[PDB]
mmCIF file of all heavy atoms in Angstrom:
data_model
loop_
_atom_site.group_PDB
_atom_site.id
_atom_site.type_symbol
_atom_site.label_atom_id
_atom_site.label_comp_id
_atom_site.label_asym_id
_atom_site.label_seq_id
_atom_site.Cartn_x
_atom_site.Cartn_y
_atom_site.Cartn_z
ATOM 1 N N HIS V 720 103.996 11.076 -0.541
ATOM 2 C CA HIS V 720 102.957 10.081 -0.277
ATOM 3 C C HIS V 720 101.880 10.061 -1.358
ATOM 4 O O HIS V 720 101.456 8.986 -1.797
ATOM 5 C CB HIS V 720 102.330 10.350 1.093
ATOM 6 C CG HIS V 720 100.941 9.811 1.248
ATOM 7 N ND1 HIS V 720 100.682 8.524 1.671
ATOM 8 C CD2 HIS V 720 99.733 10.388 1.047
ATOM 9 C CE1 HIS V 720 99.376 8.331 1.718
ATOM 10 N NE2 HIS V 720 98.777 9.446 1.343
ATOM 11 N N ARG V 724 100.996 6.689 -4.030
ATOM 12 C CA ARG V 724 99.663 6.103 -4.160
ATOM 13 C C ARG V 724 99.258 5.952 -5.623
ATOM 14 O O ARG V 724 98.892 4.861 -6.072
ATOM 15 C CB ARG V 724 98.640 6.974 -3.428
ATOM 16 C CG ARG V 724 97.201 6.578 -3.702
ATOM 17 C CD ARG V 724 96.219 7.494 -2.996
ATOM 18 N NE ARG V 724 95.078 7.781 -3.861
ATOM 19 C CZ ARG V 724 93.871 7.243 -3.727
ATOM 20 N NH1 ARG V 724 93.624 6.393 -2.740
ATOM 21 N NH2 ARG V 724 92.905 7.568 -4.576
ATOM 22 N N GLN V 753 103.602 -2.519 0.934
ATOM 23 C CA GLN V 753 102.394 -1.768 1.260
ATOM 24 C C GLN V 753 101.457 -2.528 2.190
ATOM 25 O O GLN V 753 100.752 -1.904 2.990
ATOM 26 C CB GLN V 753 101.648 -1.375 -0.017
ATOM 27 C CG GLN V 753 102.544 -0.840 -1.120
ATOM 28 C CD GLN V 753 103.280 0.431 -0.732
ATOM 29 O OE1 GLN V 753 102.908 1.119 0.219
ATOM 30 N NE2 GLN V 753 104.337 0.747 -1.472
ATOM 31 N N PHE V 754 101.434 -3.859 2.111
ATOM 32 C CA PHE V 754 100.544 -4.623 2.979
ATOM 33 C C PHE V 754 101.026 -4.607 4.420
ATOM 34 O O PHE V 754 100.214 -4.593 5.353
ATOM 35 C CB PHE V 754 100.421 -6.063 2.487
ATOM 36 C CG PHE V 754 99.405 -6.248 1.407
ATOM 37 C CD1 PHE V 754 99.790 -6.680 0.153
ATOM 38 C CD2 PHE V 754 98.065 -5.993 1.644
ATOM 39 C CE1 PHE V 754 98.862 -6.858 -0.848
ATOM 40 C CE2 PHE V 754 97.127 -6.170 0.646
ATOM 41 C CZ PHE V 754 97.529 -6.604 -0.604
ATOM 42 N N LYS V 756 103.312 -2.272 5.885
ATOM 43 C CA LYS V 756 103.405 -0.921 6.429
ATOM 44 C C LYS V 756 102.037 -0.322 6.740
ATOM 45 O O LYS V 756 101.962 0.672 7.469
ATOM 46 C CB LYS V 756 104.181 -0.021 5.462
ATOM 47 C CG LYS V 756 105.663 0.159 5.808
ATOM 48 C CD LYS V 756 106.320 -1.129 6.311
ATOM 49 C CE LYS V 756 106.624 -2.104 5.182
ATOM 50 N NZ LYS V 756 107.256 -3.365 5.669
ATOM 51 N N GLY V 757 100.965 -0.891 6.192
ATOM 52 C CA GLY V 757 99.632 -0.723 6.734
ATOM 53 C C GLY V 757 98.928 0.590 6.458
ATOM 54 O O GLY V 757 97.801 0.767 6.937
ATOM 55 N N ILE V 758 99.543 1.523 5.727
ATOM 56 C CA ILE V 758 98.866 2.788 5.445
ATOM 57 C C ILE V 758 97.615 2.515 4.623
ATOM 58 O O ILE V 758 97.653 1.789 3.622
ATOM 59 C CB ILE V 758 99.818 3.770 4.745
ATOM 60 C CG1 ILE V 758 100.820 4.338 5.753
ATOM 61 C CG2 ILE V 758 99.042 4.899 4.086
ATOM 62 C CD1 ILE V 758 101.873 5.235 5.137
ATOM 63 N N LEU V 759 96.494 3.111 5.039
ATOM 64 C CA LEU V 759 95.184 2.656 4.581
ATOM 65 C C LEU V 759 94.839 3.130 3.175
ATOM 66 O O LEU V 759 94.144 2.414 2.447
ATOM 67 C CB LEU V 759 94.095 3.099 5.562
ATOM 68 C CG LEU V 759 94.075 2.434 6.943
ATOM 69 C CD1 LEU V 759 94.186 0.920 6.807
ATOM 70 C CD2 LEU V 759 95.150 2.981 7.880
ATOM 71 N N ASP V 760 95.295 4.316 2.772
ATOM 72 C CA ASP V 760 94.919 4.822 1.454
ATOM 73 C C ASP V 760 95.648 4.077 0.342
ATOM 74 O O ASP V 760 95.076 3.837 -0.728
ATOM 75 C CB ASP V 760 95.193 6.323 1.369
ATOM 76 C CG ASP V 760 94.228 7.036 0.444
ATOM 77 O OD1 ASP V 760 93.410 6.353 -0.210
ATOM 78 O OD2 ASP V 760 94.278 8.284 0.380
ATOM 79 N N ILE V 761 96.909 3.707 0.573
ATOM 80 C CA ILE V 761 97.652 2.918 -0.407
ATOM 81 C C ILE V 761 97.171 1.473 -0.402
ATOM 82 O O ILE V 761 96.876 0.894 -1.454
ATOM 83 C CB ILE V 761 99.163 3.007 -0.139
ATOM 84 C CG1 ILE V 761 99.706 4.357 -0.605
ATOM 85 C CG2 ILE V 761 99.896 1.876 -0.842
ATOM 86 C CD1 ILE V 761 101.100 4.651 -0.112
ATOM 87 N N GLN V 762 97.144 0.852 0.780
ATOM 88 C CA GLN V 762 96.604 -0.497 0.923
ATOM 89 C C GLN V 762 95.269 -0.647 0.200
ATOM 90 O O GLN V 762 95.013 -1.669 -0.446
ATOM 91 C CB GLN V 762 96.457 -0.826 2.409
ATOM 92 C CG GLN V 762 95.833 -2.167 2.726
ATOM 93 C CD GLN V 762 95.942 -2.507 4.201
ATOM 94 O OE1 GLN V 762 94.933 -2.673 4.887
ATOM 95 N NE2 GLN V 762 97.169 -2.596 4.700
ATOM 96 N N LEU V 763 94.404 0.366 0.307
ATOM 97 C CA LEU V 763 93.098 0.320 -0.346
ATOM 98 C C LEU V 763 93.224 0.204 -1.863
ATOM 99 O O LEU V 763 92.618 -0.682 -2.475
ATOM 100 C CB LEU V 763 92.283 1.557 0.040
ATOM 101 C CG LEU V 763 90.898 1.724 -0.586
ATOM 102 C CD1 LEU V 763 89.955 0.655 -0.065
ATOM 103 C CD2 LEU V 763 90.353 3.110 -0.283
ATOM 104 N N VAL V 764 94.024 1.074 -2.490
ATOM 105 C CA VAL V 764 94.106 1.057 -3.952
ATOM 106 C C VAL V 764 94.763 -0.227 -4.440
ATOM 107 O O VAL V 764 94.396 -0.761 -5.494
ATOM 108 C CB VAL V 764 94.822 2.309 -4.497
ATOM 109 C CG1 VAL V 764 94.015 3.555 -4.179
ATOM 110 C CG2 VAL V 764 96.241 2.428 -3.971
ATOM 111 N N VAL V 765 95.745 -0.737 -3.697
ATOM 112 C CA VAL V 765 96.298 -2.048 -4.015
ATOM 113 C C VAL V 765 95.196 -3.101 -3.981
ATOM 114 O O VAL V 765 95.105 -3.956 -4.869
ATOM 115 C CB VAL V 765 97.461 -2.390 -3.064
ATOM 116 C CG1 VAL V 765 97.802 -3.872 -3.147
ATOM 117 C CG2 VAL V 765 98.682 -1.547 -3.402
ATOM 118 N N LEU V 766 94.330 -3.044 -2.962
ATOM 119 C CA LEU V 766 93.307 -4.074 -2.798
ATOM 120 C C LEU V 766 92.226 -3.994 -3.873
ATOM 121 O O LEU V 766 91.853 -5.022 -4.448
ATOM 122 C CB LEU V 766 92.671 -3.968 -1.411
ATOM 123 C CG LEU V 766 93.261 -4.749 -0.236
ATOM 124 C CD1 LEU V 766 92.378 -4.566 0.987
ATOM 125 C CD2 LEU V 766 93.404 -6.224 -0.582
ATOM 126 N N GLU V 767 91.706 -2.795 -4.169
ATOM 127 C CA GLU V 767 90.718 -2.713 -5.247
ATOM 128 C C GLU V 767 91.332 -3.077 -6.592
ATOM 129 O O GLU V 767 90.705 -3.773 -7.398
ATOM 130 C CB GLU V 767 90.031 -1.341 -5.340
ATOM 131 C CG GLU V 767 90.814 -0.093 -4.981
ATOM 132 C CD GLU V 767 89.973 0.892 -4.176
ATOM 133 O OE1 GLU V 767 89.017 0.455 -3.496
ATOM 134 O OE2 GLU V 767 90.243 2.109 -4.253
ATOM 135 N N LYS V 827 93.308 -10.544 7.404
ATOM 136 C CA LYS V 827 93.448 -9.587 8.497
ATOM 137 C C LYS V 827 92.651 -8.313 8.232
ATOM 138 O O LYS V 827 91.987 -7.791 9.136
ATOM 139 C CB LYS V 827 94.935 -9.296 8.739
ATOM 140 C CG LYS V 827 95.400 -7.863 8.522
ATOM 141 C CD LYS V 827 96.918 -7.818 8.430
ATOM 142 C CE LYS V 827 97.496 -6.599 9.127
ATOM 143 N NZ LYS V 827 98.980 -6.694 9.237
ATOM 144 N N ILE V 828 92.705 -7.795 6.999
ATOM 145 C CA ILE V 828 92.052 -6.527 6.678
ATOM 146 C C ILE V 828 90.535 -6.637 6.801
ATOM 147 O O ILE V 828 89.854 -5.650 7.105
ATOM 148 C CB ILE V 828 92.479 -6.058 5.270
ATOM 149 C CG1 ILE V 828 93.990 -5.823 5.226
ATOM 150 C CG2 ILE V 828 91.752 -4.781 4.873
ATOM 151 C CD1 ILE V 828 94.551 -5.697 3.827
ATOM 152 N N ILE V 831 89.621 -5.442 10.361
ATOM 153 C CA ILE V 831 90.105 -4.173 10.909
ATOM 154 C C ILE V 831 88.940 -3.203 11.078
ATOM 155 O O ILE V 831 87.839 -3.436 10.565
ATOM 156 C CB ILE V 831 91.219 -3.550 10.044
ATOM 157 C CG1 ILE V 831 90.684 -3.130 8.674
ATOM 158 C CG2 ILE V 831 92.385 -4.517 9.903
ATOM 159 C CD1 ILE V 831 91.609 -2.190 7.923
ATOM 160 N N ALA V 832 89.183 -2.106 11.804
ATOM 161 C CA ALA V 832 88.108 -1.185 12.167
ATOM 162 C C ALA V 832 87.611 -0.383 10.969
ATOM 163 O O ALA V 832 86.399 -0.212 10.796
ATOM 164 C CB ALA V 832 88.578 -0.249 13.281
ATOM 165 N N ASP V 833 88.523 0.123 10.142
ATOM 166 C CA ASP V 833 88.129 0.926 8.989
ATOM 167 C C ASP V 833 87.435 0.046 7.957
ATOM 168 O O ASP V 833 88.026 -0.908 7.444
ATOM 169 C CB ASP V 833 89.347 1.615 8.377
ATOM 170 C CG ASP V 833 89.020 2.327 7.077
ATOM 171 O OD1 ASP V 833 88.077 3.149 7.067
ATOM 172 O OD2 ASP V 833 89.704 2.070 6.064
ATOM 173 N N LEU V 834 86.176 0.366 7.657
ATOM 174 C CA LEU V 834 85.375 -0.500 6.800
ATOM 175 C C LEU V 834 85.599 -0.257 5.313
ATOM 176 O O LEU V 834 85.188 -1.096 4.506
ATOM 177 C CB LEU V 834 83.890 -0.348 7.134
ATOM 178 C CG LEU V 834 83.466 -1.041 8.431
ATOM 179 C CD1 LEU V 834 83.463 -0.067 9.603
ATOM 180 C CD2 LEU V 834 82.119 -1.722 8.273
ATOM 181 N N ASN V 835 86.206 0.867 4.928
ATOM 182 C CA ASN V 835 86.580 1.061 3.530
ATOM 183 C C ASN V 835 87.444 -0.093 3.037
ATOM 184 O O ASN V 835 87.106 -0.775 2.063
ATOM 185 C CB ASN V 835 87.308 2.396 3.348
ATOM 186 C CG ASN V 835 86.381 3.509 2.898
ATOM 187 O OD1 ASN V 835 85.314 3.255 2.339
ATOM 188 N ND2 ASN V 835 86.789 4.751 3.131
ATOM 189 N N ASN V 836 88.572 -0.324 3.709
ATOM 190 C CA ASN V 836 89.446 -1.429 3.330
ATOM 191 C C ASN V 836 88.799 -2.773 3.642
ATOM 192 O O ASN V 836 88.980 -3.744 2.898
ATOM 193 C CB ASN V 836 90.791 -1.302 4.043
ATOM 194 C CG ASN V 836 91.529 -0.027 3.675
ATOM 195 O OD1 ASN V 836 90.916 1.023 3.482
ATOM 196 N ND2 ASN V 836 92.849 -0.115 3.579
ATOM 197 N N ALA V 837 88.043 -2.847 4.742
ATOM 198 C CA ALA V 837 87.432 -4.110 5.139
ATOM 199 C C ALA V 837 86.369 -4.563 4.148
ATOM 200 O O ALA V 837 86.217 -5.767 3.915
ATOM 201 C CB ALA V 837 86.830 -3.986 6.537
ATOM 202 N N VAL V 839 86.293 -3.813 0.803
ATOM 203 C CA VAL V 839 86.986 -4.258 -0.404
ATOM 204 C C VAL V 839 87.658 -5.603 -0.164
ATOM 205 O O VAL V 839 87.696 -6.464 -1.053
ATOM 206 C CB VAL V 839 87.999 -3.193 -0.862
ATOM 207 C CG1 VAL V 839 88.832 -3.712 -2.027
ATOM 208 C CG2 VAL V 839 87.278 -1.905 -1.240
#
Side-chain angles (χ1 to χ4, degrees):
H720 156 87
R724 170 182 140 104
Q753 316 298 342
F754 276 117
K756 262 39 77 180
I758 285 175
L759 291 312
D760 211 355
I761 284 167
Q762 177 170 119
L763 178 68
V764 296
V765 165
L766 270 185
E767 33 221 26
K827 117 195 219 170
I828 298 166
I831 66 165
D833 173 53
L834 285 96
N835 264 338
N836 299 36
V839 174

